[PDB]
Amino acid sequence: TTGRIVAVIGAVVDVQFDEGLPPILNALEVQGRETRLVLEVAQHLGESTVRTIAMDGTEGLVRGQKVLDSGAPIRIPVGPETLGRIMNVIGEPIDERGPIKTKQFAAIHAEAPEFVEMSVEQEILVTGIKVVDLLAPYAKGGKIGLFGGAGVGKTVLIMELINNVAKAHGGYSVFAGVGERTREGNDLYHEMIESGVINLKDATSKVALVYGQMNEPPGARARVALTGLTVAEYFRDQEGQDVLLFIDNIFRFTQAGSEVSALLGRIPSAVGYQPTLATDMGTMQERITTTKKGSITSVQAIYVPADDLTDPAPATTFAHLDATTVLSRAIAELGIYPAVDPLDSTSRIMDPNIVGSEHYDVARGVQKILQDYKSLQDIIAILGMDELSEEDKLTVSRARKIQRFLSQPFQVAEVFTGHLGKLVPLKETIKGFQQILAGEYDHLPEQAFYMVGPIEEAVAKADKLA
Amino acid sequence: TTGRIVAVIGAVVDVQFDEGLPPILNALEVQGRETRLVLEVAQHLGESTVRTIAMDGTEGLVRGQKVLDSGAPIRIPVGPETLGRIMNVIGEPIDERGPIKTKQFAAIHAEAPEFVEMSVEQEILVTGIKVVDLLAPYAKGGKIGLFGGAGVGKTVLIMELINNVAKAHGGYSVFAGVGERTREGNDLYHEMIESGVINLKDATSKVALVYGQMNEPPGARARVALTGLTVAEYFRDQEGQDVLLFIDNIFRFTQAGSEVSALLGRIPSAVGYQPTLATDMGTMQERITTTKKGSITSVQAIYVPADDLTDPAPATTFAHLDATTVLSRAIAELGIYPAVDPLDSTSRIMDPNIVGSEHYDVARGVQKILQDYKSLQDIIAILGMDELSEEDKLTVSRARKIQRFLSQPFQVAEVFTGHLGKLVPLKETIKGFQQILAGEYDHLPEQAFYMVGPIEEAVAKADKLA
Amino acid sequence: XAXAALXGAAXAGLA
Amino acid sequence: DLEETGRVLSIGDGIARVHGLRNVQAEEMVEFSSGLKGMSLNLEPDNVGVVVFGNDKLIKEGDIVKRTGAIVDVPVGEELLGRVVDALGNAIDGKGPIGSKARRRVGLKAPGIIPRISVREPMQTGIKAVDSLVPIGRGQRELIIGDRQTGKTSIAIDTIINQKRFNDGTDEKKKLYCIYVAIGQKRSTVAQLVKRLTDADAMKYTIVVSATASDAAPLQYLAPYSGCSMGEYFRDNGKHALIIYDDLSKQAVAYRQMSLLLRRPPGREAYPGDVFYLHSRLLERAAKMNDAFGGGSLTALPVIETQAGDVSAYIPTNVISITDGQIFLETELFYKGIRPAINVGLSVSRVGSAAQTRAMKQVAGTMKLELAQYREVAAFAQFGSDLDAATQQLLSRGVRLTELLKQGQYSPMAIEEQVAVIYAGVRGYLDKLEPSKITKFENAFLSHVISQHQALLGKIRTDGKISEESDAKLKEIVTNFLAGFEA
Amino acid sequence: YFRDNGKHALIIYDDLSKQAVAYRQMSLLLRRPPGREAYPGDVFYLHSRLLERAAKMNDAFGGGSLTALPVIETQAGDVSAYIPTNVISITDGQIFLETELFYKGIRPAINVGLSVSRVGSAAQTRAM
Amino acid sequence: YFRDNGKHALIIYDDLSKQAVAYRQMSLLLRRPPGREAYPGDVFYLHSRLLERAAKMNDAFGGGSLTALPVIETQAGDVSAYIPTNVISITDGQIFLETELFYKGIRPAINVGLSVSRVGSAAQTRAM
Ligand SMILES: Nc1ncnc2c1ncn2[C@@H]1O[C@H](COP(=O)(O)OP(=O)(O)NP(=O)(O)O)[C@@H](O)[C@H]1O
Ligand SMILES: Nc1ncnc2c1ncn2[C@@H]1O[C@H](COP(=O)(O)OP(=O)(O)NP(=O)(O)O)[C@@H](O)[C@H]1O
Ligand SMILES: [Mg+2]
Ligand SMILES: [Mg+2]
Numbered sequence A, B: 001t002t003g004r005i006v007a008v009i010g011a012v013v014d015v016q017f018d019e020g021l022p023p024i025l026n027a028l029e030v031q032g033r034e035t036r037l038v039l040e041v042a043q044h045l046g047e048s049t050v051r052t053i054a055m056d057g058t059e060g061l062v063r064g065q066k067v068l069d070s071g072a073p074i075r076i077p078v079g080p081e082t083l084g085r086i087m088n089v090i091g092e093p094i095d096e097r098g099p100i101k102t103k104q105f106a107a108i109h110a111e112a113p114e115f116v117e118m119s120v121e122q123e124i125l126v127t128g129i130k131v132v133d134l135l136a137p138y139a140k141g142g143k144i145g146l147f148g149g150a151g152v153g154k155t156v157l158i159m160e161l162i163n164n165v166a167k168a169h170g171g172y173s174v175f176a177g178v179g180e181r182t183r184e185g186n187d188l189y190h191e192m193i194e195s196g197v198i199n200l201k202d203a204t205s206k207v208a209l210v211y212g213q214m215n216e217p218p219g220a221r222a223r224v225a226l227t228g229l230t231v232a233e234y235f236r237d238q239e240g241q242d243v244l245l246f247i248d249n250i251f252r253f254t255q256a257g258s259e260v261s262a263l264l265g266r267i268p269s270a271v272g273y274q275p276t277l278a279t280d281m282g283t284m285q286e287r288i289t290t291t292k293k294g295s296i297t298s299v300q301a302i303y304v305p306a307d308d309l310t311d312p313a314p315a316t317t318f319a320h321l322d323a324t325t326v327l328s329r330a331i332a333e334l335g336i337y338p339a340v341d342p343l344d345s346t347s348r349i350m351d352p353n354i355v356g357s358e359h360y361d362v363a364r365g366v367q368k369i370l371q372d373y374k375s376l377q378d379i380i381a382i383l384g385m386d387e388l389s390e391e392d393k394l395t396v397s398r399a400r401k402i403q404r405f406l407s408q409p410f411q412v413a414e415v416f417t418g419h420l421g422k423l424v425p426l427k428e429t430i431k432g433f434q435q436i437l438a439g440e441y442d443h444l445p446e447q448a449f450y451m452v453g454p455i456e457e458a459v460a461k462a463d464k465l466a
Numbered sequence C: 001x002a003x004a005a006l007x008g009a010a011x012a013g014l015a
Numbered sequence D: 001d002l003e004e005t006g007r008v009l010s011i012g013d014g015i016a017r018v019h020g021l022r023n024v025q026a027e028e029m030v031e032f033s034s035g036l037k038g039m040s041l042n043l044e045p046d047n048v049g050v051v052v053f054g055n056d057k058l059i060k061e062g063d064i065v066k067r068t069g070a071i072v073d074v075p076v077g078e079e080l081l082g083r084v085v086d087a088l089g090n091a092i093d094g095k096g097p098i099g100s101k102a103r104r105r106v107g108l109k110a111p112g113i114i115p116r117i118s119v120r121e122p123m124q125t126g127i128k129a130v131d132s133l134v135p136i137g138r139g140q141r142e143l144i145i146g147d148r149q150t151g152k153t154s155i156a157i158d159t160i161i162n163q164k165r166f167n168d169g170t171d172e173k174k175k176l177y178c179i180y181v182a183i184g185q186k187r188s189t190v191a192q193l194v195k196r197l198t199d200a201d202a203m204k205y206t207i208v209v210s211a212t213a214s215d216a217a218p219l220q221y222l223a224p225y226s227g228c229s230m231g232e233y234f235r236d237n238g239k240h241a242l243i244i245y246d247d248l249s250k251q252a253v254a255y256r257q258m259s260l261l262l263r264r265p266p267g268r269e270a271y272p273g274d275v276f277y278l279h280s281r282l283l284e285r286a287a288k289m290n291d292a293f294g295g296g297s298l299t300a301l302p303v304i305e306t307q308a309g310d311v312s313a314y315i316p317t318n319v320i321s322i323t324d325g326q327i328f329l330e331t332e333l334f335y336k337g338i339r340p341a342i343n344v345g346l347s348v349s350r351v352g353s354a355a356q357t358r359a360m361k362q363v364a365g366t367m368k369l370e371l372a373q374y375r376e377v378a379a380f381a382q383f384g385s386d387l388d389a390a391t392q393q394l395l396s397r398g399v400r401l402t403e404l405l406k407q408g409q410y411s412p413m414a415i416e417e418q419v420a421v422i423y424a425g426v427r428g429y430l431d432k433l434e435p436s437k438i439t440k441f442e443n444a445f446l447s448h449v450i451s452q453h454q455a456l457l458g459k460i461r462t463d464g465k466i467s468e469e470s471d472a473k474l475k476e477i478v479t480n481f482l483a484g485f486e487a
Numbered sequence E, F: 001y002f003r004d005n006g007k008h009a010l011i012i013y014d015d016l017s018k019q020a021v022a023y024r025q026m027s028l029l030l031r032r033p034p035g036r037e038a039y040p041g042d043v044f045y046l047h048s049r050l051l052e053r054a055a056k057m058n059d060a061f062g063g064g065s066l067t068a069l070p071v072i073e074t075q076a077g078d079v080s081a082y083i084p085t086n087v088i089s090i091t092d093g094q095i096f097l098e099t100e101l102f103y104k105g106i107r108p109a110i111n112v113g114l115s116v117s118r119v120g121s122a123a124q125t126r127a128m
Helices: A130-135 A154-169 A182-194 A218-237 A250-263 A277-285 A312-318 A329-333 A352-383 A392-405 A426-438 A455-463 B130-135 B154-164 B182-194 B224-237 B251-261 B277-285 B329-333 B357-383 B390-405 B411-417 B426-437 B455-465 D128-133 D152-162 D187-199 D217-236 D248-262 D275-284 D314-320 D331-335 D358-375 D389-404 D415-427 D438-451 D454-463 D468-484 E016-029 E043-051 E082-088 E099-103 F016-029 F043-051 F082-090 F099-104
Strands: A002-009 A012-016 A027-030 A038-044 A049-054 A066-069 A075-077 A105-107 A143-147 A173-180 A207-213 A242-248 A295-301 A323-326 B002-009 B012-016 B027-030 B038-046 B049-054 B066-069 B075-078 B104-107 B143-148 B172-178 B207-212 B243-248 B296-303 B323-326 D005-012 D015-020 D028-032 D037-044 D047-052 D064-071 D073-076 D084-086 D102-105 D143-146 D177-183 D206-211 D240-246 D297-305 D326-328 E008-013 E065-070 F008-013 F065-070
Touching (some): A049 A218, A130 A352, A173 A218, A173 A250, A207 A218, A218 A242, A218 A250, A218 A277, A250 A295, A250 F043, A277 D248, A392 A426, A426 A455, B104 B224, B130 B357, B130 B426, B154 B243, B172 B182, B172 B224, B182 B207, B224 B243, B357 E099, D005 D047, D015 D064, D028 D047, D102 D217, D128 D415, D152 D177, D187 D206, D217 D248, D217 D275, D248 D275, D275 D297, D275 D314, D297 D314, D358 D415, D389 D438, D415 D438, D438 D454, D454 D468, E043 E065, E043 E082, F016 F082, F043 F082
Parallel strands (some): A143 A295, A173 A242, B143 B296, B143 B323, D143 D326, D177 D206, E008 E065
Antiparallel strands (some): A002 A012, A012 A049, A075 A105, B002 D037, B027 B038, B038 B049, D073 D102
């Protein structure tokens, strides 16, 4: 079908079809433009006219301009060939490395895994990260709220995860930048590169990059997450791996939703968001799960508005999170990295009924001690570290060892940390903390535990430390 | 006349006439239905069409369907034959006891008694309730209102009052269940039977029941009040002897109006309410009144949404009462029952020349100490009592004792207080409060005053506490 | 209040 | 044929404007060329506004719309049990078609005044706190309320599971078929939900309606009405059902979405004027019928999710003003380790005392009393030096009693088991003991009397009261067990 | 009538709050777009127009007068509120009553601080 | 022009608040749909498309740059209002000024705690 443009009002184009009318969600291609202009279908205004939202500037459009129904929604190059490449909302390359040549194309708008495809069980997804794995275990096909921003190892952590997923699960990763700052994108690009996760020379790239820059119109920043989603889905539905999905940042998704909504003239709901806030979110979130074929795990960067946890945006979002990973500037200040907060970070799966009594107990152990020490913290500084009991003095010692044992060297940061990375195993993780709690290493000194892998290294470090 | 259904949207049915257009307020009967479906004319849309509000569910209706002009507004059985019976919005029995065989019928829509028709006698109505009697005394033939957010005590209070007042009345009573719980209607009915107010054997019942609960469509809820109202009017004017009128909850009528208002096609006012909110309330409230012909002592429950007393519904209600009992969640949460706010409840009768100066002085006495305590609260909140003046501490003690002495066990709430209901006589109340004020009990503990009848019991409770 | 959003993710361990 | 058919004029924002269909009745189901379903909402002079029960991507200008002559209804009957269906009744467990004989409108008006009777039969949860302090009667509406993650659903579950104890029973009058309606949730959650039910052999007596996070707003909106109708079948036939609406919060947002898109005036919180009614109509349907109507019943446990414990919000207040009590779960409690995080003070059961067992009356009766005297002295203040022996003693039960009320998941207790353990605390048999031992005492003292004393339990349970002998026997029973209890 | 005929009148408008509501009603029903707080954009004008009529005529016009005492109902003692401020900005001062004052025993509950008279002593006898 | 030609340019937008208003005025008059604060659904886009144009080029392109100092006027310190929210979210940091500070004697009134530079030290000299 070949339709005409009947009206152009900002980012909302109306297109009339003489013969066949494109269903909602289809992707139309504007004829005669320097660059590709995709109009997504949004409504059937009646009278053979559709109401669409432009995926880029409608500058220059002319009533009467020709529009070609691509006879489908936005489809994109999916597959391995995507890995290490940067791609647009409509699956275009934006890295200047030539065409993304894949066999399959995958429409972005996809329904979610039927009930009968659902997994019936909770399984922790190991990352090899002591804090994460021990206190706030990720969950297969679950959603993680990643708090904290700059200065704190946000990118480095994002990069280790990627690495560790490729390593321990042979699973690839996708990176969706929803409302990315052009400056920051390019900076992420070269950062991944320098760390290997991306490889311009070979075919060893472990990440595919999807970008929806901040200049892009609401509709584009509205879809980019889906696009990235489509990509990840492939490594699950076609190759049954355990993909990783990063959405940065989940807030800009929602925001992009409201903008599109408003443009479509619908009445906003509470706090100005879209009346379809919950649906907009669910039709997306729900595609992120463990099906029988594999699983997609999503790391979502969250931005809470007005620091208001009950704001509709954030509130809605929590309905889908299985765990939070709180990056903390303070922690970073102790030199501790990853700068994850062992007391603020949480996981739904931290249930003995799920992680097993052992795992559950250790965790609950590490936390209490961490908590107790926190109490004493106030006393120590004021009244001086001495009314401390044979007991009060051990909780501290241990805690201090613990706090350190919770830190760790990332392989991603080897390039210029001059230190070898460590991918501690869940078994090793429980053991390690188990013993410290136990009192096995009370004789060991603090610094012994700083920046090491498995407890064994804590022991050797002590050696080298006389 | 026979119109045709032109359009259907919820409870708003538009019917077109060819020869005779029914006037506004007329009741039409939809043809071709298992049960009666009355439509009340709302307006003349022009074009020989009339916009109406259905009195029952509209499912099944079909465009083109035949409608018959009843020729008058909703009329219902009025007379003594209503006593002891349960009836509909439209006046049909709903007690499964056959038809209500009355000589006369009355239409629900009537004009409010004229100015010259008003009455100005002001007699106190003792209830036996300490807070009510002392601070915001009701009045014979007066208008009483019980404000309350969800689950605060509106109903309980209405029951206790029916108990303490209705039961020993000698005259008639009308209970109108508006938009409340069906189970409640059932609870009352059977209870009424039990106490003999309703007699299914003789003609000795003193109460007529009208109901249009939580399960009815908006239109029903918007008219039941009028229905119950009419029933009462009859006993007032047509027979000369003092009536009692209980409504639970009048807020439901206003809410109901908001339900259909959009459908009627009106630009909403503040908070999404109908622009006719005040008038609607007014032409209805103005019929609930005492006159030279008869007396109507009415107690209406007034639900307060989101606990917001500034909500247009409750806000606009104050102006129609002679006495107001504002219930508080905060007080209730403290365990004080009834949860009446002593500084927020008022009564036109609180006048020395009506209740006497002894009564007038204690009342204002109690309020002033409670007000004083209220101001001290901010400080007490951060710093507690320590830093309080010996003088201030004494107001606090007294206030907390008066506060407690204001509570009281209701027969109706025995199952919850775990105590035997109490009915304190006015002089008993004036007294017990005087003494408290007068420092005659500064020695007893607060607890002694909580949940008791007369002051005497508060002294004993003190001994028992030892 | 007004400029709180410049803290940030402050009560995060509560979510 | 424009009498029984119509062609779509325009689809957008989930409202299909169909031309024709001159014969549709209001609220009648209609069908789309794509096998999609809809409800005839508006009957206007020259079109029918239809509410599509699925993704409107499927519908297009011109599509054919056919009547069905049926006001929205659903499959109903015992053959739903053990099935996982969608908001329309269609199976989603992929277990083959539902062989349903009966159907039922989703929008029937609740039973009036006359046909009902005061709730008088207990609706056991198996949860100590609830069954002792917030007794639910059959045909009651009791609201589960709290913030996210406070253990709301968990109460529904233990309740469902606890029913097996009767369903596997002899007597049909003591049974309870459960219905769990999921709205706005995650499938991964519902899927795991049934898995848990299945492993407990509870699905055999449960129906599960699902309208999840990904289902069209109208499906989410619909779901509770459907589940209700199915529950109604049991209520209507001298039987007894339990329906769980999880949550009403999300339904309300679903309805709001619909309302705003239809352009209806947004009010408080942007909610449409009729959201209360959305809830009242539904919840009125739970009910206790009298003997002349089958003596059957429907019990509703609707779930509402508060933000920051704000129990005054628009939606929470609405619901509170409908049900017959609430069970508020506290974030504080939950973290402080008290679970079920039940707020003893705030929570209520307007109608349940009468449904309460005497045995419980016997022990639970002096429990809130004791807890009442503990509620006070138990301040926020962590470091407080106290005086007075009495107040001291009061403070002492309080911590014990509190330990008795903690309960794990999936382990619903028999009423007689509850009275037993509660007996130990309320009688003083745990006063001389340390609060950290309570939990341990319970399990140990419970297995003990379950193993050795099925004799006394059965009496208690059978008699339904605590007879002089039973109480005498019980007293020694705690006595000796104590005497042998290893710290 | 009195004002224009060298006589003296006093008018109490009890209260202008309910009148505005009436206005808002009448207005919305005519389909005139709702303004701030749902009221017609001209609520101010609704009251100004009216209260400007209260006046003191010179000897040339009979020396008569019209004095107005309009009543406004706040909510939660909030005088800063839009309608309350609208009206405060027309009249020659205000008498603000607080319930706190009242309960406290200060009756009239006049709030000295918040009340004013734009006429000042010119309206008082020398004795006063 | 400067940026592209190996040169360096600095730009000050004073203010972006007023511009947003200008845009809003046009939008509403054209009758486009209004959102929060009456702002069109593409007001974010208006600034993002503006502020992104500033950037540091690569030698391959001339090494020239365009730095931007856009000004936003908050209201009663409400950084979370609509337009302030966008722009904050778009830029690499913020220099937060306070009246309290100012009057207290701190001039310039920079609230050091709340101000930021994502770029950071990568822009500071070794000396500094
Ligand atoms: N006077 C009272 N004494 C003790 N408890 C009371 C009293 N009044 C109310 N309660 C408690 O609070 C519950 C609610 O009382 P009720 O009178 O039904 O409130 P309501 O305002 O009628 N609620 P609702 O209509 O749902 O907004 C009762 O079931 C009791 O548990
Ligand atoms: N009685 C209990 N004892 C111990 N842990 C419990 C108990 N009940 C629930 N939990 C834990 O508490 C978690 C939250 O309970 P859940 O019933 O899922 O809460 P909720 O209020 O439904 N929250 P959500 O539905 O996620 O908004 C569960 O996943 C369990 O891990
Ligand atoms: Mg009530
Ligand atoms: Mg839940």
